[PDB]
């Protein structure tokens, strides 16, 4: 019997700073035990300082990104070139995903950018549209590997102040763009070591008030 879904592997990662936000994702595309491409980008600039990735089944991921990009375009036409805020984009994506509630897009979607106060914002979605703003989110094949590391290093979970008898927690603070990229690079090199569907290359999209910058790094190709 025909199976309409497939698993293209890979993994994605979104971190939010004070005045910036990053959305990273490896460039490997796979099916079963074969590599389809070592460089197939799945993190996209969608305009209005919104970066997006829909990891999982690539055909569904591409369709979704394509539809959202188109949603941004028509938002400009119908509302006098108004900038689509990150919170508005998130809600719009929920309706895109839930629209196919009974024949879902097999993807974990993450978007990143700046909120209306200029502060860094990351939103994450399940396959059928449930969404939530967070400081931190990993998605895809190696999400289970990366996410707990982010809880520890970004949100300082299970870390207490030395000598305080485990009474005072390590205080939350925003990370610099330099410190965040260090965590992203280490998260992906670690995930590459232990997950077969992750590797080849790492592409990071950073979002500041100035615009959308890109950074690329090599990953192990085995």
């Amino acid at each position: 019997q025909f199976n309409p879904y497939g698993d293209n592997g890979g993994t994605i990662l979104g971190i939010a700073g004070e005045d910036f936000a990053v959305l990273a994702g490896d460039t490997r595309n796979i099916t079963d035990y074969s590599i389809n491409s070592r460089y197939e980008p799945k993190v996209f600039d969608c305009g209005d300082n919104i970066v997006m990735s829909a990891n999982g089944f690539a055909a569904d991921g591409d369709a979704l990104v394509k539809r959202f990009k188109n949603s941004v375009k028509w938002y400009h036409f119908d509302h006098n070139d108004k900038k689509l805020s990150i919170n508005s984009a998130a809600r719009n994506i929920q309706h895109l995903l839930y629209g196919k509630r009974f024949f879902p897009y097999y993807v974990h979607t993450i978007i990143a950018g700046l909120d209306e106060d200029g502060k860094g914002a990351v939103y994450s979605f399940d396959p059928v549209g449930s969404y939530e703003r967070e400081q931190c989110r990993a998605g895809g094949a190696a999400a289970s590997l990366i996410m707990p590391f982010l809880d520890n290093q970004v949100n300082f979970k299970n870390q207490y102040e030395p000598g305080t008898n485990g009474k005072v927690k390590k205080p939350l603070k925003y990370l610099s763009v330099e410190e965040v990229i260090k965590l992203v690079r280490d998260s992906f090199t670690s995930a590459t070591e232990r997950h077969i569907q992750v590797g080849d290359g790492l592409e990071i999209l950073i979002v500041t008030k100035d615009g959308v910058r890109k950074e690329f790094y090599e990953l192990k190709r085995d």
Partner: protein
């Protein structure tokens, strides 16, 4: 819901410095029966694109008709149909990619794996894959079916990344493709010796080669192999 009946095996391809090469054997298998031997599975669109198709042949012939009709439709009310407003590889691919995904979404897929190889108007090499699921990807080397498992490793030794493309000539690239076709003949049970090969160059244009054969094969060592273990005679 479909099951493929008459099928075509591997389509292989790669980029080189000035263009792209694509190849596919001339077999139409009917299960284990090698039923049809005169099947062309590379279909040129204009003088700048070649679509290589594997999987169900009835669906391949449908796709042929769509591409044929696309050329006709593009010519309508288009004075620049053989110039600026000619069909690009990227246009042809996106159309097919749209169809493939729409058909999978209706649970009635075109049971194929497709590789659109060509050269754009600005000289850039185009090589992209799409299949029955609507899954798309691009790479310096692309291959379907058994080609993915056996050809890609061999072709990636020539062009392992983007920076290796300018360093790869058409002579070196074609040699690797022809070699890969031999390896597939050794090891793919639903392959044939006869195949077609197409080169799309930004300078010399489209060169379509028919009725090629796998040659320079190594079979001599077989005579020395006796039994399956102990047997000496």
């Amino acid at each position: 819901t479909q099951q493929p009946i008459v099928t075509g095996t591997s389509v292989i391809s790669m980029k080189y410095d000035n263009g792209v090469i694509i190849a596919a054997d001339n077999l139409g298998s009917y299960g284990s029966l090698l039923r049809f031997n005169g099947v062309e599975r590379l279909i040129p669109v204009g003088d700048n694109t070649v679509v290589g198709i594997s999987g169900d042949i009835s669906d391949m012939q449908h796709i042929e008709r769509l591409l044929k009709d696309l050329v006709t439709e593009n010519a309508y009310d288009n004075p620049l149909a053989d110039a600026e407003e000619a069909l690009e590889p990227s246009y042809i691919f996106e159309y097919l990619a749209t169809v493939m995904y729409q058909r999978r979404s209706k649970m009635n897929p075109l049971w194929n794996a497709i590789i659109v190889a060509g050269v754009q108007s600005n000289g850039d090499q185009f090589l992209r894959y799409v299949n029955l699921l609507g899954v798309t990807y691009s790479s310096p080397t692309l291959a379907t079916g058994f080609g993915a498992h056996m050809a890609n490793p061999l072709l990636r030794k020539v062009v392992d990344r983007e920076s290796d493309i300018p360093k790869t000539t058409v002579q070196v690239a074609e040699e690797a493709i022809v070699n890969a076709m031999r390896v597939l003949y050794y090891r793919d049970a639903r392959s044939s010796r006869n195949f077609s090969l197409a080169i799309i160059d930004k300078n010399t244009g489209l060169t379509f080669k028919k009725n090629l054969q796998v040659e320079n094969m190594k079979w001599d060592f077989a005579k020395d192999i006796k039994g399956y273990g102990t047997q000496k005679i």
